[PDB]
Amino acid sequence: RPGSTKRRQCYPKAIPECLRESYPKPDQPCYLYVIGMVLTTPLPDELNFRRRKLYPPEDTTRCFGILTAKPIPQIPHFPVYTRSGEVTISIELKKSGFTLSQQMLELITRLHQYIFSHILRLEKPALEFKPTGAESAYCVLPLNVVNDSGTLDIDFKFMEDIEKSEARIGIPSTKYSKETPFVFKLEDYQDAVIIPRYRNFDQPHRFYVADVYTDLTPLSKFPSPEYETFAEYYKTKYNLDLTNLNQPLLDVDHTSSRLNLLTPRHLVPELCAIHPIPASLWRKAVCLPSILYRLHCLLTAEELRAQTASDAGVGVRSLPLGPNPGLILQALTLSNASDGFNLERLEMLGDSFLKHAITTYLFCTYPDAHEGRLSYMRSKKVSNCNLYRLGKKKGLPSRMVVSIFDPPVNWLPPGYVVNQDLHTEQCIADKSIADCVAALLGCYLTSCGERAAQLFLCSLGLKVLAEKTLNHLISGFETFEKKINYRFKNKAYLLQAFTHASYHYNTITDCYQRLEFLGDAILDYLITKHLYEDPRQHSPGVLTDLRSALVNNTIFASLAVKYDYHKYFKAVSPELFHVIDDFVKFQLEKIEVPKAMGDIFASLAGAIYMDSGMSLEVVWQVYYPMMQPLIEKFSANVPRSPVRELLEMEPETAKFSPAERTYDGKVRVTVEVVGKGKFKGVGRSYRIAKSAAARRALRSLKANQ
RNA sequence: UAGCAGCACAUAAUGGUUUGUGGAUGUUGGGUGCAGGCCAUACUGUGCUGCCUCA
Numbered sequence A: 001r002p003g004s005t006k007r008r009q010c011y012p013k014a015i016p017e018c019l020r021e022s023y024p025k026p027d028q029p030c031y032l033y034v035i036g037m038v039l040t041t042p043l044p045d046e047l048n049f050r051r052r053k054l055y056p057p058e059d060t061t062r063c064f065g066i067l068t069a070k071p072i073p074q075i076p077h078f079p080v081y082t083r084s085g086e087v088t089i090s091i092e093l094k095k096s097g098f099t100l101s102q103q104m105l106e107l108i109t110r111l112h113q114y115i116f117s118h119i120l121r122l123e124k125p126a127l128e129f130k131p132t133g134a135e136s137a138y139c140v141l142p143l144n145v146v147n148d149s150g151t152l153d154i155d156f157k158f159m160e161d162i163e164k165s166e167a168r169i170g171i172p173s174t175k176y177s178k179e180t181p182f183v184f185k186l187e188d189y190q191d192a193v194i195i196p197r198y199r200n201f202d203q204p205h206r207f208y209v210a211d212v213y214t215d216l217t218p219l220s221k222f223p224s225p226e227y228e229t230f231a232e233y234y235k236t237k238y239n240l241d242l243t244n245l246n247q248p249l250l251d252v253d254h255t256s257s258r259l260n261l262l263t264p265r266h267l268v269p270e271l272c273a274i275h276p277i278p279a280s281l282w283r284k285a286v287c288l289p290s291i292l293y294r295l296h297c298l299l300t301a302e303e304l305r306a307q308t309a310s311d312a313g314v315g316v317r318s319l320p321l322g323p324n325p326g327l328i329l330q331a332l333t334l335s336n337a338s339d340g341f342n343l344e345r346l347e348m349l350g351d352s353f354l355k356h357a358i359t360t361y362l363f364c365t366y367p368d369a370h371e372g373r374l375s376y377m378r379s380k381k382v383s384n385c386n387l388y389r390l391g392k393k394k395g396l397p398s399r400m401v402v403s404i405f406d407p408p409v410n411w412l413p414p415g416y417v418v419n420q421d422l423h424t425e426q427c428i429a430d431k432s433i434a435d436c437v438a439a440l441l442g443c444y445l446t447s448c449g450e451r452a453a454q455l456f457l458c459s460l461g462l463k464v465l466a467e468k469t470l471n472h473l474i475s476g477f478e479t480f481e482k483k484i485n486y487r488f489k490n491k492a493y494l495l496q497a498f499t500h501a502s503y504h505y506n507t508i509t510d511c512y513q514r515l516e517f518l519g520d521a522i523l524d525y526l527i528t529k530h531l532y533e534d535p536r537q538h539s540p541g542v543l544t545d546l547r548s549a550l551v552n553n554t555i556f557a558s559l560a561v562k563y564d565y566h567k568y569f570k571a572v573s574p575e576l577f578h579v580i581d582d583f584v585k586f587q588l589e590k591i592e593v594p595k596a597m598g599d600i601f602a603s604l605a606g607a608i609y610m611d612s613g614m615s616l617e618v619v620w621q622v623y624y625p626m627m628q629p630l631i632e633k634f635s636a637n638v639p640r641s642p643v644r645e646l647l648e649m650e651p652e653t654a655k656f657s658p659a660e661r662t663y664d665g666k667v668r669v670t671v672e673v674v675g676k677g678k679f680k681g682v683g684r685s686y687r688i689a690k691s692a693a694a695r696r697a698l699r700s701l702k703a704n705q
Numbered sequence B: 001u002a003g004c005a006g007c008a009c010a011u012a013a014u015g016g017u018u019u020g021u022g023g024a025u026g027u028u029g030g031g032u033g034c035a036g037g038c039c040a041u042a043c044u045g046u047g048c049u050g051c052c053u054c055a
Helices: A102-119 A156-164 A230-238 A279-311 A325-331 A344-365 A371-381 A384-393 A430-460 A467-473 A477-483 A491-497 A513-532 A540-550 A553-562 A574-589 A595-611 A616-636 A642-649 A686-704
Strands: A008-012 A030-042 A063-068 A078-082 A085-098 A127-129 A139-145 A152-154 A192-196 A207-213 A249-254 A272-278 A416-418 A425-429 A654-656 A667-673 A677-683
Touching: A030 A078, A030 A279, A063 A152, A063 A279, A078 A279, A085 A279, A102 A127, A102 A139, A102 A156, A102 A279, A139 A156, A139 A279, A156 A272, A192 A279, A207 A279, A272 A279, A279 A325, A279 A430, A325 A344, A325 A430, A344 A371, A344 A430, A344 A513, A344 A540, A371 A513, A384 A430, A425 A430, A467 A491, A477 A491, A491 A513, A491 A595, A513 A540, A513 A595, A513 A616, A540 A616, A553 A574, A553 A595, A553 A616, A574 A595, A595 A616, A642 A654, A642 A686, A654 A686, A667 A686, A677 A686
Parallel strands: none
Antiparallel strands: A008 A425, A030 A063, A030 A085, A063 A139, A078 A085, A127 A416, A139 A152, A192 A207, A192 A272, A207 A249, A654 A667, A667 A677
16 A cells, blocks of 8 residues: 555655765866864774774864755754764855866866776775766865965865876886895885785785884784794795885785774884875875765755755744754654664654644534544545645655665766666655654644644645523632642533533533543643653654553543542443443442543533633643652553453463453453463453453462562 | 675565455355465675675
8 A cells, every 4th residue: 555664666866956966077166175174082092902092083184075056054062983083074165156267177186086996996996086076076185284374275286296106007116136235215105095006916904103113113023923024924925125224114904894983883114105195195195985864854954944944934944943953853864873872762752743633623624523523534634644745745755865875886986877766766665754754743843833843734735724501601709729739711611522412411611522532632732842852862762652551431431530620520421330330349349431421521621622712721731730749650650451461471471362252252361371371351352451451460479489 | 994704674576374354156164355463485784793805
């Protein structure tokens, strides 16, 4: 069915408008952004398994910039988890409206290719570098501080120095002899990336210089147990005799192959070529895939924020408000993506508000439609099928984050195309598109409030926007008004709330059932909002359990008895009065629960809502003090089924019999607890019977402990 | 800068199970649809490893 988990569809991935076709043209105005990088949380030495020097990216004058033909909007700063620790990223406009020559742009584009293909090794046989034909068409370039002024600019000199360098295309062929011996220069290695010249010619392993040992030489002990000395190693493995046996040695670390950094995890110089790119900048280069991916994700979320501010009138189109893009990115992120956050909390809050908004809308729009009809219409509008259609129509599927980020497998680098797919497409379930709509509703509710959430629903396409007889029938309700600490402006709502359909003496209001319908959705929403806002910050699963336990007709009947509602209840059914009296007796001492007692509890919420001028707050002021002891009790001790509690205590030893239908239509169930006895329960249903059996067993087990 | 094999978690797939829920031929409740919680087979990713390439 449409809106089911069992139905899956493929969608193309959205690329933000500001990155699409964004290739700088010769002699045309362009934008230069700086990637600001600050080490905000250093990694503990215990997790730094080599105890290597942490490198704050900010300690170094060279960085990267983004060159684009289109402006990038402000996005929240975001963390990236490097081997140094948590680095906060800023994307800052440095220059706007400047021009580049064909030669300058070619130099940038060649270096940009060189980064993704040669440095990062993200060019694969399935990928082609076509910067003018690529959908995501921006260049990344080196920036440096000009003349120690602190001012960053395009380091054209460094790009040209890379182009003149023979070390760009492969390993330099410069062999040292006794006539031209190797001379070590310390300055050339302090921030170097090096390439060993004697091995792995197709895939030269690159290393950072981590340190320079001035106390160690080629005649010193080798790190592999296979060779005694560095000189012996190079002679034995590659037939290379060293010209300078007194040169210092380099302590080296591999260049990182891990390019997903969005979450926390928890040699002889003479035989090396210097790669023209410094190690500081190369450490920054390794972050580019995660940075550009995160940038892409946040830009997609901001595009959706700005679109919703246009379509719904909710927020401001450009910020100097609407939700933070990080919360939209949360509502777009499935738990499968593993990104440290997910939509599930926002979804549940959204669902509760959605019910309320539609219920209120239906109640007010259809003043003559009875409860069962409003309930039926409600059930169709809130369906996963309808919500999927709305989410598809809004173009959410292309914007969702579905899978775990993996640069070489599912990410297309800027200026590349796919040779005709995990790079360009994603497969999504119809239900997940429905769940995302509710999470977005929860995002707009939490950030912008209830009116803004209603306008958001309207933007999706959901339409969400006698007296003597009265005084006689309400006689004595002044004591009830005092008990609930609320006084009605219009006592007809109070009468309606306490009028059963059997109570034909009321000819001046309807029965309670319409106000019951309205009150049900109000109480669900208010309780859910309160549970979501709870300082304990309950998990998605626990929120579901608490919502289920608190939003219940049995609890509402129990409260209605505790707050004397049964004394004001207007009915003409002796049988209903007996069932109520038996339940009232059982509740006063601490058996069928009379539905009508929970229904009038909801109906009075509906009454107060209408009498207060649609004030949810006034309802909550009345109901919160009544419910608080239960909200505290269940939020302290998240509730359980007695059958589940028995199965948790006795998983292999507790076996339940089949349902035996007794002669009175009632179900009987036996639970056998191996070695501990057989306990029978009876009730009108298998669970009242199985729960009664499980409670008798649990009582016996707890008594024998 | 590589491959593989164990163990933790996330995750979709095919089966079952269980709570909720719906109009239904509804002879007095087993037909199907969508959600949660579990049990089983099987996939990927990250991580704790283990063996094993180059150094």
